[PDB]
Structure 1
Amino acid sequence: MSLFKIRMPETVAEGTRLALRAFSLVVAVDERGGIGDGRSIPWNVPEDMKFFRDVTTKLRGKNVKPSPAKRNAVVMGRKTWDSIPPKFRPLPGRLNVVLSSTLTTQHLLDGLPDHADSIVAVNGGLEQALQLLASPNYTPSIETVYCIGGGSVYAEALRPPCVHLLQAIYRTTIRASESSCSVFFRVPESGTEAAAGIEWQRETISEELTSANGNETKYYFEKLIPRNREEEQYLSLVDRIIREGNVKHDRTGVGTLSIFGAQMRFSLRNNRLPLLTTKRVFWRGVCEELLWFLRGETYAKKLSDKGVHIWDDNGSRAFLDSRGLTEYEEMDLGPVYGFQWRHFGAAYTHHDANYDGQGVDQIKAIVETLKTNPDDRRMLFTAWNPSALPRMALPPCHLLAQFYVSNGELSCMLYQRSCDMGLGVPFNIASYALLTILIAKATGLRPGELVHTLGDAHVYSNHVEPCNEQLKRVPRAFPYLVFRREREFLEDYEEGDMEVIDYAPYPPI
């Protein structure tokens, strides 16, 4: 069963090679927005120093010791490096990236010593640095990148192409003011040319604190984030369902609030992955299940074994019996999803039987069509097989997708009949994002947009309370998907082959 597989083309890698790495930015400014005199930092505020060290050293997981394996990186201009006393450099617990056209890596090591490799020089600007940090050697070993700046470096961060990779701004405002500030830092206001389409929202602001520096200086911290309209689509819909939805009751008898017919878009460009930030999504499961679908797999134990239990309840003897499927071996789910994708209309017996070259192979057909006739409007697959329906543990929710090509980009539309806004929808968004990414790789195209179409969009009545809390969260920027390695056939791709980078969801509640 090898000639029934999808062969990936020679241009599989350049499809999804990460051009630039996503970064955050950390800065201190006065009320006039000035950042320094061009070689030194004017003010002395120890509480800003503590914040700076903390935001740039600490890692996502709790109590995780920074190490070559997993650490943060700080990127700085040469003059900023010079402003730090040689005794305190390199900054401990972080990878020091220094921008200079006159100083090499080894050259920086001269200066003060006297460890491992905590210093790298880059001949170029911030783009070149983010480019280097995009390579396997730094992705995903380096968890978060911070631009600790220098005027010209901040200047480069705040304009294309870099500004579109800027995920957060951690700004300290010092309430002093003087002539001595020559270099400046200003965040572009919403809807201006300098903003290049981005709309900076305020995530948090601290109360005004006083600095114990002898000068009684006031200061405060702000975290700014780039407005995530895509996730707001989703949040809006949830809010509309609670406010205006109809009370319905699904098969069990559980209450639900329901709206009918809706549509959402998500950009897949430049490695961008629409994993929701207001509530963490179980990505590993998303990844494992799609690959399981793609393979035409119908044995749930293959997911259960890899620690993915989303199909556990639907695969039990108890449930299968209650669907009259009394002859299915436990975890055998019948001709569901993947089977219809790769073997449409094929007669089903048991999971472990051979189904090679049986039924219609819709995925393969689409892959072949995209490569030859990209303008084709029949490029779509479905899992809604009325004949097979009774033989399935469960009817498909996401039952149809159509692909579309424009300017060498692959868009895909998914139609979902029943969409649980709490769990299904976030999961399925990621799922079809991955599919579209993979299919694009398989056809030598770039990812485009994912369009989601919803039928009965519902929120569960007891979920209303949790959901209302989540509505008061401002969506954060989406993470990115990169591939550790490629594989010769499509069906050979494993979860470990790909990595989700810069995923910073909110905590549970």
Structure 2
Amino acid sequence: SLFKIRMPETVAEGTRLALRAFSLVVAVDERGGIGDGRSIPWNVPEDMKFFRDVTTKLRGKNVKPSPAKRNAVVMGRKTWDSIPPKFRPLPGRLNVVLSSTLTTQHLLDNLHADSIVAVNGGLEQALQLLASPNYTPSIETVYCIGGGSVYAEALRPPCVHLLQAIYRTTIRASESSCSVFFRVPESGTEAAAGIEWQRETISEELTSANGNETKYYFEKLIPRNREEEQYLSLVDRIIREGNVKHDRTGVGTLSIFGAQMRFSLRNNRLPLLTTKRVFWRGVCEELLWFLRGETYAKKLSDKGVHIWDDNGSRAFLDSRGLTEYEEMDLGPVYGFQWRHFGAAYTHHDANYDGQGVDQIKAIVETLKTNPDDRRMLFTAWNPSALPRMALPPCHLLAQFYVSNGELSCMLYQRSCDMGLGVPFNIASYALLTILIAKATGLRPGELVHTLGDAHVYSNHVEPCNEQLKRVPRAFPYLVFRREREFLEDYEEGDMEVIDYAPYPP
């Protein structure tokens, strides 16, 4: 007992008050107008249906959204009025109206069902409230539905940065008399705020069954994800240009040598790959495992994480000359080296308190006292210990760096499978940083990822081409439901990763 690493008092100076990411639904005329002062000028029933369906429907199979798992819509006061009483409140969804004249009760009235909440501030507060401990597991996607004033805030920092998709219905009607305006800025413009907007989908031109045979079309717009895209263009480069190589088993690979990647961890954005679902539950579970200096791999198994299972079998241990290790015991691997570098190993049950160099601790120590130190790095690559290990480490090195009170972290990895190894490990180090940040009272900055031998497996090739066809969506956020007294005492339950919107596992 301690020995452990003790967490600081408050959250990091000028810190991220946990927000929620959102999506925006809007209809415009060709000029980009939304409603002549109050309300809306045109009448397209097809938009209404398309509105209903976007706002209601959850991810997955035919899963009716009960209060226990549902979607939420955010609107200003004027719009909430604008909705006809026959469809008020909006069914299936959590009507969220911001107001500074009316309260939650003050709005409830025909009668009488509690699917609404009024909020005292703007969009930020909504997102804060929606990301708040109870609302978060229950509420899947947030949608902003208008109007002008609410949209203004959406395309303004720091909302615009939490803005993750725009569904935009264009109406082929035209007059000048429509007052307010909504234009998505072109990329690389001042108004763009450095965001790059792309078409993800776009419907046919369609004609409305209303009174004027008026044309309309749909389109989904997403904020281009350079970060994830660099990962992909590395995969493509390997496939096109990699050297054919053959590993220890004998499987064929394509590999390149030496590359570098970066990912913003700012405001707990978390680079889980969109183009393919990552095993976050395992990621998180394994790293906390690492952080304790753990070794008995069945701790992971017991918790439904089966990866060290292959390398933990009686067979493989023996195949690696580890007679004396009981099944699922790995020796001085990763985390052990992290916390007790150079400590002589015997078995996993054995007490390792005080033996060997506790790198992580000393790092946490230096960070707080002396941020400018060019020596804050831990290693798992111990030549003397390597033979006693079930597996030499891939991610063998990490160096920390601090600027503008933000913590960055370079990770070095000698052998990198883009297939799953890599995306997994990116998430893994992203978490470490965020945690270490939290432990040293700093905001998180960048993860820099340096790859040694980067490879794709011979089987993986064609699969990977399927992945390369997809566009990367925006990244999710790590948010803490709870904090702990000691870093070591953190658990998967304590955090929850919000707004992860991938494509199939």
Determine if the TM-score, normalized by the shorter chain, exceeds 0.5: yes
CA separation in 2, counterparts of 1:131 and 1:304?
35
Distance 1:378 1:444, change over 3 A: same
| Deviation per residue, 1:400-441 (Å, 9 max, x gap) | 000111111110100000000110110000000000000111
Q: Which piece of structure 1 moves more, 378-387 or 54-63?
A: 54-63
Deviation at 1:117, TM superposition (A): 2.8
1:420/1:457 contact within 8 Å kept: yes
Percent of matched pairs sharing the same residue? 100
Q: Deviations over 1:268-309 (max 9, x none)?
A: 011211111000100000000000100111111111111101
Displacement, 1:12? 4.5
2:285 equivalent to 1:288: yes
In the alignment, the residues of structure 2 paired with residue 283 and residue 128 of structure 1 have an alpha-carbon distance, to the nearest angstrom, of 28
Measure how far apart 1:358 and its partner are.
Answer: 0.9
How far the C-alpha of 1:16 sits from its partner, in A, is 6.8
After TM superposition, the structure 1 = structure 2 runs for residues 210-289 of structure 1, keeping only pairs within 5 Å, are: 210-289=207-286
Greater Cα offset, 71-80 or 449-458: 71-80
- More displaced stretch, 172-181 vs 332-341: 172-181
Partner deviation per Cα, 1:132-180 (whole Å, 9 max, x = no partner): 3233242343221110011121111112121111010011112222234
Contact 1:18/1:134 (<8 A) preserved: no
The answer as to 2:365 corresponding to 1:365 is no
Contact 1:16 1:441 in 2 (8 A): no
User: 8 Å contact 1:27–1:171 — kept in the other structure?
Assistant: yes
Unaligned runs of 5+ in 2: none
Superposition deviation, residue 35 in structure 1: 1.3
Q: Tell me the distance in 1 between the aligned counterparts of 2:146 and 2:504.
A: 29
SS at 1:140's partner residue? Answer: helix
- Counterpart Cα distance in 1 of 2:327 and 2:272: 32
Q: Which residue of 1 aligns with 2:432?
A: 435
Q: Distance in 2 between matches of 1:452 and 1:187?
A: 33
* Partner SS, residue 288 of structure 1: helix
Question: Structure 1 residues 495, 205: closer, same or farther in 2, change over 3 A?
Answer: same
The alpha carbon displacement at 1:447 in A equals 0.7
Q: Is residue 71–residue 140 contact of structure 2 (8 Å, CA) maintained in 1?
A: yes
1:482 is paired with a residue whose SS is strand
> Within 2, Cα distance between the matches of 1:315 and 1:44?
65
Shift of 1:116: 4.6
**Any idea what the Cα deviations from partners look like across 1:247-276, whole Å, max 9, x if unmatched?**
111111111111111111101011211111
User: Is contact 1:410–1:447 with CA below 8 Å preserved after alignment?
Assistant: yes
Distance 1:116 1:285, change over 3 A: farther
How far apart are residue 71 of structure 1 and its match?
1.6
**C-alpha deviation, 1:120, in angstroms:** 1.5
* Larger CA deviation: 91-100 vs 38-47: 38-47
Shift of 1:14: 7.3
TM-score, scaled to structure 1: 0.96
Tell me the distance in 2 between the aligned counterparts of 1:500 and 1:303: 20
- Cα 1:332/1:12, change in 2 over 3 Å: farther
Partner SS state of residue 11, structure 1:
coil
- What SS does structure 1 have at the residue aligned with 2:311? coil
Cα–Cα, structure 1 residues 15 and 330, in superposed 2: closer, same or farther, change >3 Å?
A: farther
Matches of 1:29 and 1:12, distance apart in 2: 42
Q: Distance in 1 between matches of 2:13 and 2:72?
A: 26
1:34 match: 33
Give the Cα–Cα distance (whole angstroms) in 1 for the partners of residues 212 and 252 of structure 2.
61
Could you tell me whether the CA contact under 8 Å between 2:12 and 2:443 is conserved in 1?
Answer: no
Decide which moves more: 88-97 or 205-214: 205-214
Please give the alpha-carbon distance, in whole angstroms, between the structure 2 residues aligned to 1:161 and 1:327: 56
Shift in Å at residue 316 of structure 1?
0.7
Query: SS of the counterpart of 1:471?
Result: helix
| Higher deviation after alignment, 417-426 or 317-326 | 317-326
TM-score (normalised: structure 2) = 0.97
CA contact (8 A) 1:15 1:445 kept: no
In structure 2, distance between residues paired with 1:67 and 1:270: 30
String of CA shifts for 1:44-95, please: whole Å, max 9, x gaps: 2222212211111111232333233322111111111111112211111111
How much does 1:17 deviate?
5.0
Conserved? CA contact 1:300–1:333, under 8 Å? yes
Kindly provide the CA deviation profile for residues 213-239 of structure 1, in whole angstroms up to 9, marking residues without a partner as x. Answer: 243232221110001110011011111
CA contact (8 A) 1:231 1:475 kept: yes
Residue 88 of structure 1 corresponds to which residue in structure 2?
Answer: 87
* Greater Cα offset, 10-19 or 365-374: 10-19
| Partners of 2:18 and 2:479 within 8 A in 1 | no
Secondary structure at the aligned position of 1:170 is classed as strand
